From a paper:
In this study, we report the first heterologous expression and X-ray crystal structure of the arsenite oxidase from the autotrophic arsenite-oxidising bacterium NT-26. The structure of the NT-26 Aio was solved to a resolution of 2.7 Å. The asymmetric unit of arsenite oxidase contains four α and four β chains. The same analysis reveals that the four heterodimers present in the asymmetric unit are arranged as two stable heterotetramers, and each heterotetramer buries 22000 Å2 of surface area (meaning the tetramerisation buries a further 6000 Å2 of surface area). The heterodimer of NT-26 (α and β subunits) superimposes with A. faecalis (1 g8j), 948 matching residues with an rmsd of 1.84 Å for cα atoms (the values for the individual chains are around 1 Å). The Mo metal sits in a five coordinate environment; four ligands come from the two dithiolene moieties, each of which comes from a pterin molecule. There is no evidence in the NT-26 Aio for a sixth ligand to the Mo centre. Another distinct feature of the NT-26 AioB Rieske structure is the absence of the disulphide bridge (C65–C80, A. faecalis numbering) shielding the cluster from solvent exposure.
Aerobic arsenite oxidation is catalysed by arsenite oxidase (Aio) which is thought to be an ancient bioenergetic enzyme that was present in the last universal common ancestor prior to the divergence of the Bacteria and Archaea. Aio consists of two heterologous subunits, a large (93 kDa) catalytic subunit (AioA) which contains the molybdenum cofactor (Moco) at the active site and a 3Fe-4S cluster, and a small subunit (14 kDa) subunit (AioB) which contains a Rieske 2Fe-2S cluster. The Aio belongs to the dimethylsulphoxide (DMSO) reductase enzyme family of molybdoenzymes but is unusual in that it’s the only member of this family to contain a 3Fe-4S cluster and a Rieske subunit. Since the 3Fe-4S cluster is a one electron acceptor it is assumed that it accepts one electron from the Mo-pterin and then transfers an electron at a time to the Rieske 2Fe-2S cluster of the AioB subunit.
Numbering used by the authors:
A (entry chain F), D (entry chain D): 44 to 175
B (entry chain E), C (entry chain C): 2 to 844
């Protein structure tokens, strides 16, 4: 009761990620598209030994279009109404129509090398509760 | 990044109370609904238990109506009780079709809530300067003081001693109810000459040029942006500043989504996808988005030298006239054919300061405006090929000899740009010559700023040119100042000098008030008036927050804003709507129209007591108990077709409302006017439009060429998408302030390398007007020597470096500003979290 | 009534991080724990899933540890991450035994939260006055400006040009770390004479009298309130102002709950339930509660005429001495026996202003203080029978000839009352004569205000009497002012005059700064210094919120406060504790000790650049990176027994800590001192206590008799239970502001009837000092002609009507104030919701 | 899931109440002691035709002692630490140690005259959720 109860879900292992190549994932369920991304530099919310593995919702929080990733810029870009998000700065909207910065996963790197997601810092598009 | 950490929101139930709401903010006037329901009741996930009739236990798809963001949710007082509210864009509204901007989508979160602690900055009680500081008091006390001081000064020195600054606009902080109330106080009860508007230092129009020509500035509809062959966007950053007009009407044209519609409404005429000409010295996200939707081949960005628009338009006019690409029958039938002689001081100056340009026939305008492609290329910095291409895109007939339909749109790049009167006319010339007024896919229009909501008594007494109020104040004239809903400290021209003198003059009265006994009110008022006689100023602020200029005022009166009151206004299409009250004003705050009424009543009482019964009588006609009373006394009785409009009737029409003027009422529908001038009869005595003989004469405002020549950088200035106006609400909004704690100044990275500046560095911008601060934001698209600074911003006011320079009609020339830049500090810690990446969408 | 509408709170989980926390606020120093855990994790209802090990799905019984109120919950930043926090009183702490006051119980809710929008008023960045307004900037910039101006002034005019106002207290806004840092800056690096404390306008002690006699003012323990036969409470409203000391220690005595304990520790001595003498002109809720717990027969409320305490005590001393109800062996063994002559100007005046009273032997004190029961009855207004009864309750031996154990406690009714030096001594005389110092059930002590946390270098250079700083400032002297953690605008004496001049003088520097170029810093500093040379003042404010006096300052530096830093202090029992950091400072704010360090470092740099390397060198010894570094350089190296105390060791001792001074360390326990003077060796050169020959000489502060004689009402003043200090946090707390939007003035209902005033009316209080406003609160228990106004309050500052009058040592005589009252306004609308019922509990 | 779900419980009928005589009641369950009270004057949260029927928790929100009612004063009084609450002013703490005003019931008067409680505006003592 009180708070939303987030599940602790395995998303991937650290060995699956290549520098600057986003890995498709879903959290906190099948229907909530996101990505894991290794950025190569220490950044807010980032985990792993280099502190550079982040996880975000990949669905624009304005009107729900799927975001595309620019590798040269390291930004998420929205084809709907031209929003831009920075995963090197906690998903800050560089410019856009969303009243939210990009929802970011609370990640944990296990003992072995598995990456777990245990929460999300903002409301994911298309749901009035992050856990349904 | 700022993150709210709100995992879930209460679901709007099936039985929520629905309110029609127009966006508080920009000209577009997007439609919303506010749903409210008792605190401690809620909706559920099954379709029967929520307002949408949808299963909310499933992820919604893109563009779903069945979702809202945290900033659209709050808890607010309604008839004394806390209620949940969601303020959600309306899918059915033809303006926005469900879109909400980063601004509109946070109306809920920027509303007052004791429960969730939003906007606690909001004023709740009248405040008066006494006992050494600002102190809260009752309305009776505060109004009595304001009335007594005002009445004494006006009796002793005349009404010219009363200076007024007031909104004249629509929407939150304006509207028909509120412009009528203030209007009636200062123009009916009184005859105040020394009055200025919220965005300019005199009681003038922004667009005298177009109006004098017979062409009202809001003549088309938003559908015309969908139907035009070419859109000409001048001095507008529409994606950031008229967001949803651009997204919901311009984009479909550029994408070719409109073709079906174009062919139905205009068969037997060819139609390709829309092309767009953008006239703007700076490459903006608007330019980028057009290129991205239409293709680079269909976007023509004319990156003119700052303030050279008039040269551009004159060249275009000449070329089009010579080629014969003009609506010949429109010119013959609907425009002035009478010759008329140039005034003796032409072309440097008009017949007087009241008339900067010469109104005339097409032929005389062409001869007077004449400029070659080559001369215009020198002035504007454009290539000859670019100017010719523009003329082709505006004037060249389509395949079968059919006239090209062009919608001409302009905003503040033009209106606050060089030679306002003549530039406006030069643009209007193009619309008139090509017959693009009063027809589908046409128009020459303001893309606008605030919504519109003006109705007031005659302003004849004010004069043309009107008094330059800021210069009066800076020069030590005036005794009492009433400030309604604007903040010159952040937003006026020559702002640094203005603040130095305003502080010094209001301080005189503060020191007088601190040293006088308040409980003996006659002694207090005599002390105030003595300070005024010595050159002080007694200042009264009517507002919703503690403002910057309010730190100099002696009385603060708390206003209620849209949503806490019923409010009516029209958008940039003349689309009029009622915003139905859904919450209570915070504390004891009251709507501006009622404040005006209550002030009037106090003036009546006080003057009656003093024994000036004659003057007392002038303040009758303010027995209003609710804002609707102001609507009925103003709009209903005084607007064109007002007899057809009531709250009840507007309510039934919803967020779509109707387009002014009303022409009738049948079967529960106010009948409106889609486009102006469809009959070719214009707003002049004889019904013919006039062209303007408007030759280029350089930078015309005093000081400007001098300022340009003696400083290093252009300090262009304007809006950012996230920030609404002077950040009056945004300064207490973490999402906005987390992104830009300081105002940015967009700088070319090589300009920065040359000056030893790094991203985030705090820099002083300075010139002979004043100085200010901003945060260096590296911007690859910026041209060398050309910076752009966010205007109006509390943590760095760019108005400080704008000169006192205006045109003859006292139009402030903000955009033409030059200055030097130097480093104040290495990037502060509170700026380390910001992204400094490009604002341009990459595909 | 304000209602949060919070239906449920997150449950603290089993694995929450625990922090020891002392209350931020009052002297009692109640124990709390702050529990924190990740946002989006939570506890559950079953015992295994929460910190309490209890089934939380069942209603808890009265006094349960397994519950917390909404004001004890918030969300705060911790090491960069949002976390839940609950700050909950500690059941195991011997101070409070689980109690939390209305103040302490809202530490969480008055903490800074971006997530839940609490205390957004909190400062986040350094601010500097420039470009017409206050503007944010970096630390390097802000510190450079402060250092340059300060250094220039000190070089040109000497250190006397530097004025300082600083906290000297413990707890939030003080503590050992912070008093050391500021102390070291101004007394070690510099030798600032013109320095004042937060609650008084010179660098003096509140209690020179008791100290000069050899009796440190915090000599007992809180257990002694449980063990005394009689408590004598003077000038204290303990239920409202030392709430939990009163509730958790005095009440058990009065109720008879202590008898078991009394008999175990003091067998072979009789014990009845405690009786209490309360010396206070006003009947307070404290008196009501004592009567309600002990019975009216066991409470003796001496409602003395304002400022007549000394008469009372002298009479009591005389009666007790004559009856022989004195500890004869204590007098012979531990007090001065040497005869010593009265100074030539006695009894009107002492040997000098440094020494208002004459220290002496018991016998000489008795002869000098001599006053009959009848003389004291005239002066105090009491009945003879009342004064005799008090003597019996203080001095009369118990059944078997055993001495009566009396704890004498006093606070600001005495300390800010008439003739501070002599009244304090008169009271101490009673304790000394009855042998009630250093023994169980005894003590003559401050009941205190803030917690204590003072350690600083020698203050010898300051002088005695020290400089009256407010008079220097009001007189146009001083150039630069550093204000740390106090707000004279709300809380100084003669405040109306103070504000008028302070504004005028700081305005001079503001106008200079506005007109100068900031980016050329040398020109800016020269402009500041020119304004100072002409009589201006450059003021720097170090604080956590935008303060009132801060509206006059030119630089504001943001502080971190307890909880955002580690902090150490002692309570009124000398009980020292560490408050362990549990959250981050907001924005870029930093602890005061580190601000001081950084300022020292900038002074070193700037003076080095100016070429005064010698003077630069004085500012070394500030290489501190964390608050613990300040603790180790200060307390650890300088306090008595400091070598035994470390953060690590204090942490292991929990909220119970230990009582200072430390005398050793064994097996994880700092060994302390329960009571002072248990050996009968006092704090004088020869180790003997002195009595005080302290004859009554009327109202001694200049102006006071005159002010009384020429005005209608006593304007008594002081605390309210709900309001903490000057409402610096409370002004952004809806629960407090919903209850008292204006400060109340308690008035007898027939006084109100006579004056034509109704409950809630807004009234001006005025006299020859100044004027202010308050809300009439009808108070049946108030005596005719005697009003009580809440002090320190932003919406009506009663300090405005207090005169400049001090005693010889510059102690402000706030409590003796008289003035006239007249109506400003009928009760405002924002006051209609208030209850005006009696504050006294009815059975 | 969340937003606390309050039950709509019958507490009494309007005919049962006498002017200034509190009627013992319990809401939102058996274990949550409160009172209904007819005050004789229109007051905040009050219902019925005269708008004077209020309902409050009777358990002190400071440390949970049962409150006593003074009829002459129209106040609730706490014997624990001397708090005083005003039911004519939304349960405002006139003076006390609670950081809350007295929790008040959201009441509804049915067509037949029955009084229903459908909510509570503040956290009841001894529970971390008003509904257990
Ligand atoms: N996000 C947001 N939107 C708003 C507002 C807001 O505060 N925030 N406010 C509203 C208001 S009140 C207004 S007035 C409108 C303003 O709407 P716009 O006028 O579109 O906004 P601005 O940014 O002032 O100016 C637009 C463009 O003028 C260009 N410009 C500058 N100098 C010149 C010149 O000499 N010639 C030409 N051709 N162009 C030039 C600038 O590069 C800028 O891109 O927007 C409204 N919309
Ligand atoms: S949402 Fe509001 S800000 Fe303008 S674009 Fe639409 S009206
Ligand atoms: S709770 Fe805090 S305010 Fe005083 S009584 Fe205890 S220290
Ligand atoms: S949906 Fe991504 S910007 Fe509109
Ligand atoms: S429990 Fe009611 S006052 Fe402490
Ligand atoms: Mo505008
Ligand atoms: Mo104190
Ligand atoms: O505007
Ligand atoms: O104090």
């Amino acid at each position: 009761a009180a708070g939303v109860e987030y599940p602790a879900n395995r998303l991937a292992n650290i060995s699956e990620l290549t520098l600057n190549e986003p890995l498709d994932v879903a959290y906190p369920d099948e229907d909530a598209a996101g990505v894991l991304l290794k950025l190569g530099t220490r950044v807010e919310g980032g985990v792993g030994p280099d502190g550079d593995i982040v996880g975000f919702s990949t669905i624009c929080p304005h009107k729900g279009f799927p975001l595309s990733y620019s590798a040269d810029n390291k930004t998420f870009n929205c084809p709907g109404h031209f929003s831009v998000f920075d995963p090197e700065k906690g998903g800050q909207q560089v410019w856009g129509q969303a009243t939210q910065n990009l929802p970011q996963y609370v990640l944990r790197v296990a003992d072995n090398g598995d990456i777990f997601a245990e929460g999300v810092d903002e409301l994911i598009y298309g749901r009035l509760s992050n856990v349904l | 990044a700022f993150k709210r950490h709100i995992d879930r929101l209460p679901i709007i139930p099936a039985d929520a109370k629905k309110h029609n709401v127009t966006c508080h903010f920009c000209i577009v006037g997007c439609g919303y609904h506010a749903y409210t329901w008792p605190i401690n009741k809620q909706g559920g996930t099954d379709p029967q238990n929520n307002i949408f009739g949808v299963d909310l236990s499933e992820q919604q798809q893109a563009e779903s109506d069945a979702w809202y963001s945290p900033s659209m949710y709050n808890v607010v007082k309604q008839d004394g009780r806390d209620v949940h509210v969601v303020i959600k864009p309306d899918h059915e509204c033809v303006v926005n079709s469900g879109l909400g901007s980063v601004r509109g989508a946070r109306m809920a979160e920027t509303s007052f809530s004791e429960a969730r602690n939003t906007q606690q900055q909001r004023l709740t009680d009248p405040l008066v300067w006494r006992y050494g500081q600002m102190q809260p008091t009752s309305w009776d006390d505060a109004l009595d003081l304001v009335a007594r001081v005002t009445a004494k000064i006006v009796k002793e020195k005349g009404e010219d001693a009363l200076i007024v600054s007031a909104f004249d606009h629509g929407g939150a902080g304006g509207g028909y109810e509120n412009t009528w109330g203030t209007g009636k106080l200062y123009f009916e009860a009184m005859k105040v000459k020394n009055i200025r508007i919220h965005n300019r230092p005199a009681y003038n129009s922004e667009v005298h040029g177009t109006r004098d020509m017979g062409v009202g500035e809001l003549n088309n509809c938003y559908e015309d942006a969908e139907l035009a062959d070419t859109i000409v966007a001048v001095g507008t950053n529409a994606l950031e500043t008229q967001t949803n007009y651009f997204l919901n009407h311009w984009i479909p044209n550029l994408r070719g989504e409109s073709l079906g519609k174009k062919k139905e409404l205009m068969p037997e005429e060819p139609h390709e996808a829309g092309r767009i000409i953008i006239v703007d010295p700076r490459r903006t996200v608007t330019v980028n988005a057009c290129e991205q939707t239409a293709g680079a081949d269909n976007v023509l960005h004319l990156a003119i030298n700052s303030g050279t628009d008039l040269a551009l338009f004159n060249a275009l006019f000449t070329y089009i006239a010579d080629k014969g690409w003009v609506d010949r029958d429109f010119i013959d039938k609907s425009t002035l054919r009478e010759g008329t002689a140039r005034p003796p001081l032409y072309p440097a100056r008009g017949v007087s300061e009241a008339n900067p340009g010469h109104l005339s026939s097409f032929e005389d305008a062409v001869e007077g405006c004449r400029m070659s492609i080559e001369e215009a290329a020198e002035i504007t910095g454009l290539d000859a090929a670019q100017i010719i291409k523009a003329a082709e895109w505006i004037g060249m007939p389509k395949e079968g000899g059919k006239r090209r339909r062009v919608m001409f749109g302009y905003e503040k790049g033009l209106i606050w740009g060089n030679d306002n009167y003549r530039t406006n006319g030069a643009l209007v010339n193009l619309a008139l010559a090509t017959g693009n007024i009063g027809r589908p896919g046409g128009g020459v229009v303001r893309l606008g700023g605030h919504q519109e909501g003006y109705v007031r008594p005659s302003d004849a007494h004010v004069g043309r040119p009107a008094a330059y109020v800021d210069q009066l104040l800076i020069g030590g004239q005036g005794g009492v100042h009433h400030i309604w809903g604007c903040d010159h400290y952040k937003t006026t021209l020559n702002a640094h000098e203005f603040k130095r003198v305003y502080k010094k003059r209001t301080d005189m009265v503060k020191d007088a008030m601190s040293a006088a006994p308040y409980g003996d009110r006659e002694a207090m008022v005599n002390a105030i008036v003595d300070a005024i006689n010595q050159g002080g100023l007694f200042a009264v602020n009517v507002d919703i927050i503690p403002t910057k200029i309010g730190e100099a005022c002696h009385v603060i009166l708390p206003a209620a804003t849209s949503g806490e009151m019923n409010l009516t206004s029209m958008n940039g299409e003349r689309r009029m709507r009622l915003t139905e009250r859904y919450m209570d004003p915070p504390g004891q705050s009251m709507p501006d129209c009622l404040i005006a009424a209550r002030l009037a009543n106090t003036m009546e009482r006080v003057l009656t007591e003093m024994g000036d019964v004659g003057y007392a009588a002038q303040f009758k006609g303010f027995d209003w108990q609710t804002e609707e009373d102001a609507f009925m006394d103003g709009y209903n009785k005084n607007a064109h077709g007002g007899e057809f409009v009531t709250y009840e009737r507007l309510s039934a029409m919803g967020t779509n409302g109707f387009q002014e003027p009303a022409t009738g009422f049948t079967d529960g529908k106010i009948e409106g006017t889609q486009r102006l001038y469809t009959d070719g009869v214009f707003s002049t005595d004889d019904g013919k439009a006039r062209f303007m003989d408007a030759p280029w004469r350089g930078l015309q405002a005093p000081g400007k060429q001098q300022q340009k020549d003696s400083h290093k950088y252009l300090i262009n200035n304007g809006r950012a998408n996230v920030v609404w106006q002077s950040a009056y609400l945004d300064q207490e909004n973490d999402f906005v302030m987390d992104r830009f704690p300081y105002p940015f100044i967009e700088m070319n990275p090589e300009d920065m390398a040359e000056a030893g500046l790094k991203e985030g560095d705090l820099v002083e911008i300075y010139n002979d007007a004043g100085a200010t601060q901003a945060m260096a934001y590296p911007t690859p698209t910026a041209r060398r020597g050309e910076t752009f600074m966010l205007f109006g911003f509390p943590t760095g006011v760019q108005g400080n470096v704008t000169s006192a320079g205006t045109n003859e009609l006292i139009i402030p020339n903000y955009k033409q500003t030059w200055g030097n830049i130097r480093k104040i500090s290495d990037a502060p810690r509170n700026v380390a979290h910001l992204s400094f990446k490009s604002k341009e969408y990459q595909s």
